[PDB]
Subunit: 112 residues, 2 copies
């Protein structure tokens, strides 16, 4: 992945549209963190519905501007009353429930 962005510096691209799983997205972000392309000048677009699921705090103040899509608006009270019911659940009973946010795959599962 070092040689990947070095191949991107053969044309010196600033405009990267990632389309990966959020685990693989966070891998690529850590590669960008390793080489410092999160600085001002670059721009990123995360092509999934779990834009809030990815780690934004580690690249919030690097300099590049990251765009994305969140299908589940957390400011909605229909969502927020579910979130207040979400985090209060036990991790030993419901793993992944005692969290501030939720994956969209879990949300559409609840919507299903």
């Amino acid at each position: 992945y070092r040689s990947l962005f070095q191949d991107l510096e053969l044309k010196k691209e600033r405009r990267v549209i990632l389309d990966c799983e959020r685990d693989k997205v966070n891998d690529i972000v850590d590669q960008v963190i390793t080489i410092g392309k999160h600085v001002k000048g670059y721009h990123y677009i995360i092509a999934n519905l779990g834009f809030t699921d990815g780690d934004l705090l580690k690249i919030q103040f690097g300099g590049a501007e990251v765009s994305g899509f969140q299908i589940v608006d957390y400011d909605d009270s229909l969502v927020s009353k579910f979130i207040e019911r979400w985090s209060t659940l036990e991790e030993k009973e419901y793993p992944g429930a005692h969290t501030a946010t939720i994956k969209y795959t879990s949300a559409l599962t609840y919507d299903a």
Copy 2:
């Protein structure tokens, strides 16, 4: 520490000589990683005998 390097961008320095404990050195490195001043153009000098002890 965000505002620290923003104050260093008031004169836009590329030449930082750190003199801290290696725990506090690794804190400042993670701040540089957070803001991306580890890119080409900057230069750093770690003023201790444990240069290999820090996360390079």
